[PDB]
């Protein structure tokens, strides 16, 4: 990914965008009952925190592109992976307005809360005014696809959100990149049965993690693996990637009956998006707040994965690959063990920033005691072994509950909180309740106990 050209908006046409200086994050009432180093992230270039510059900070994740061209390897990756996906027999068939937009089995009713785009979010329109879920109206809608088209900028907001004291210093804040509510619908339209197809197959066909429910899909995993798991982690994947791999992703969703509108991918990869006063144009890397976005960098991890493969080890059974993505979290097994720190190198060649599995100084042999996913560790049931829980380390949970966007979201906020902590065994869960229970606020909650969420575990499988 990489900026071609920026400017003030003014100078081509376009409004300036107000974004919310403030952050919504403050402490919660459990914020000194617990122990986290995290802060608010930087929204503005005047928050007194910073040490470096804001704009080049937010903006600098764009490295460039490292590759031109699709290659032999990538190609090969194509047919490959195109040829799991085709086993699957994904609808091809469009998806109407009425199910992209208000759901269906498969795929869930646009979020109402996420930014409506522009240029509704310089009308002074939103979402709520648009549709509702009783009527699954789509005259609105459809009356606002004919008068604005598609294919409209992004809105770039700076993503309000928990980061380390680093990333405050070195103004290191995530960017949220807002599809038009357009693009949004008519995207959902075209892919709407391949992402439904997704939602509904995690696994090792898909490639792909998407929807899952970790509860459940922990116990399927080690099956689905094969005997040497391999991971890494990337730095910066969405901004990595190159023009050359949405060329790769639309190749797949052609091969596998997508052909006729993969022009969205272009979309994707080569836009145009508006930040505040400036307007600038990106060629490669992935916008995250779009339509796809999870499901589309997962695919292309896919082809990342067997792309190295394929160049670092000639010969290589791909039929033998067992990976799962979550756009850039991956996990990945073959029968016979492979040097990550090798395929680091060759990824590098394709515009990659591979580093060693969960910030590791070196690269070591990944392990079913070591390897994360989601965050969450994986550990075999003490009574029942062929059960695997997901576990989300405490840390984690702790930074979390210390702070809070909406006081009246506080219930469910710490009731999604739980639902993870339990995991890490009785002792830890009781201690965390009993840490909650001690201040009035989560006295007054009502959270499940233990030996509950246990039974309901088991008895879900």
Same mark, same amino acid.
């Given at each position: 990914?990489?900026?071609?050209?920026?400017?003030?908006?003014?100078? &081509?046409?376009?409004?300036?965008?107000? %974004?919310?200086?403030?952050?919504?994050?403050?402490p919660?009432?459990?914020?000194?009952?617990?122990?986290?180093?995290?802060?608010?992230?930087?929204?503005?270039?005047?928050?007194?925190?910073?040490? !470096?510059?804001?704009?080049?900070?937010?903006?600098?994740?764009?490295?460039?592109?490292?590759? !031109?061209? &699709?290659?032999?390897?990538?190609?090969?990756?194509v047919d $490959?992976?195109?040829?799991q996906?085709?086993?699957?027999?994904?609808?091809?068939?469009?998806?109407?307005?009425?199910?992209?937009?208000?759901?269906?089995?498969?795929?869930?009713?646009?979020?109402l809360?996420?930014?409506?785009?522009?240029?509704?979010?310089?009308?002074?329109?939103?979402k709520?005014?648009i549709?509702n879920?009783?009527?699954?109206? !789509?005259?609105?809608?459809?009356?606002?696809?004919?008068?604005?088209?598609?294919?409209?900028?992004?809105?770039?907001?700076?993503?309000?959100?928990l980061?380390?004291?680093?990333?405050?210093?070195?103004?290191? @804040?995530?960017?949220?990149?807002?599809?038009?509510?357009?693009d949004? &619908?008519?995207?959902?339209?075209?892919?709407?049965?391949?992402?439904?197809?997704? $939602?509904?197959? +995690?696994?090792?066909?898909?490639?792909?993690?998407?929807?899952?429910?970790?509860?459940?899909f922990?116990?399927?995993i080690? &099956?689905?693996?094969?005997e040497?798991?391999?991971?890494?982690?990337?730095?910066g994947?969405?901004?990595?990637?190159?023009?050359?791999?949405?060329?790769?992703?639309?190749?797949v969703?052609?091969?596998?009956?997508?052909?006729?509108?993969?022009?969205?991918?272009?979309?994707?990869?080569?836009s145009?998006?508006?930040?505040?006063?400036? /307007?600038?144009?990106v060629?490669?890397?992935?916008? @995250?707040?779009?339509?796809?976005?999870?499901? *589309?960098?997962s695919?292309?991890?896919?082809?990342?994965?067997?792309?190295?493969?394929?160049?670092?080890?000639?010969?290589?059974?791909?039929?033998?690959?067992?990976?799962? %993505?979550?756009?850039?979290?991956?996990?990945? @097994?073959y029968?016979?063990?492979?040097?990550?720190?090798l395929?680091?190198?060759?990824?590098?060649?394709?515009?990659?920033?591979? /580093?060693?599995?969960?910030?590791?100084?070196?690269?070591?042999?990944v392990?079913?005691?070591?390897v994360? *996913?989601?965050?969450? *560790?994986?550990?075999?049931?003490?009574?029942? +072994?062929?059960?695997? $829980? +997901?576990?989300?380390?405490?840390?984690?949970?702790?930074?979390?509950?210390?702070? /809070?966007?909406? +006081?009246?979201? !506080?219930?469910?906020?710490?009731?999604?909180?739980?639902?993870?902590?339990?995991h890490?065994?009785?002792?830890?869960?009781?201690?965390?309740?009993?840490?909650?229970?001690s201040?009035?606020?989560?006295?007054?909650?009502?959270?499940?106990?233990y030996s509950?969420?246990?039974?309901?575990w088991?008895? @879900?499988?």
């Amino acid at each position: 990914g990489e900026i071609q050209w920026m400017r003030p908006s003014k100078e &081509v046409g376009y409004p300036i965008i107000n %974004a919310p200086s403030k952050t919504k994050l403050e402490p919660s009432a459990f914020h000194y009952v617990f122990e986290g180093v995290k802060e608010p992230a930087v929204l503005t270039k005047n928050d007194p925190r910073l040490k !470096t510059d804001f704009e080049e900070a937010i903006f600098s994740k764009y490295v460039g592109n490292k590759i !031109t061209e &699709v290659d032999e390897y990538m190609k090969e990756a194509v047919d $490959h992976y195109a040829g799991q996906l085709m086993s699957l027999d994904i609808n091809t068939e469009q998806m109407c307005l009425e199910d992209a937009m208000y759901g269906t089995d498969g795929l869930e009713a646009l979020d109402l809360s996420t930014s409506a785009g522009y240029p509704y979010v310089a009308m002074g329109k939103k979402k709520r005014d648009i549709l509702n879920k009783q009527t699954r109206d !789509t005259k609105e809608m459809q009356k606002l696809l004919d008068t604005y088209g598609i294919n409209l900028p992004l809105v770039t907001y700076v993503k309000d959100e928990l980061r380390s004291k680093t990333k405050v210093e070195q103004g290191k @804040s995530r960017l949220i990149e807002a599809s038009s509510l357009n693009d949004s &619908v008519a995207m959902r339209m075209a892919f709407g049965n391949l992402y439904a197809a997704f $939602h509904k197959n +995690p696994g090792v066909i898909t490639g792909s993690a998407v929807g899952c429910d970790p509860d459940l899909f922990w116990s399927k995993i080690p &099956v689905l693996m094969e005997e040497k798991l391999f991971a890494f982690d990337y730095t910066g994947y969405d901004a990595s990637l190159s023009p050359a791999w949405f060329e790769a992703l639309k190749m797949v969703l052609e091969k596998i009956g997508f052909g006729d509108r993969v022009d969205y991918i272009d979309y994707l990869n080569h836009s145009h998006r508006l930040y505040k006063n400036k /307007t600038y144009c990106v060629k490669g890397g992935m916008p @995250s707040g779009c339509s796809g976005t999870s499901i *589309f960098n997962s695919m292309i991890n896919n082809l990342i994965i067997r792309t190295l493969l394929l160049k670092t080890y000639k010969g290589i059974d791909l039929d033998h690959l067992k990976m799962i %993505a979550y756009g850039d979290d991956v996990i990945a @097994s073959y029968p016979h063990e492979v040097d990550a720190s090798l395929l680091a190198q060759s990824g590098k060649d394709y515009g990659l920033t591979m /580093t060693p599995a969960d910030k590791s100084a070196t690269f070591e042999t990944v392990t079913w005691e070591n390897v994360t *996913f989601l965050k969450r *560790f994986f550990r075999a049931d003490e009574k029942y +072994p062929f059960l695997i $829980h +997901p576990v989300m380390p405490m840390k984690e949970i702790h930074e979390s509950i210390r702070w /809070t966007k909406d +006081p009246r979201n !506080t219930q469910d906020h710490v009731r999604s909180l739980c639902l993870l902590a339990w995991h890490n065994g009785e002792e830890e869960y009781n201690k965390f309740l009993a840490k909650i229970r001690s201040v009035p606020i989560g006295r007054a909650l009502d959270l499940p106990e233990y030996s509950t969420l246990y039974d309901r575990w088991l008895d @879900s499988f």
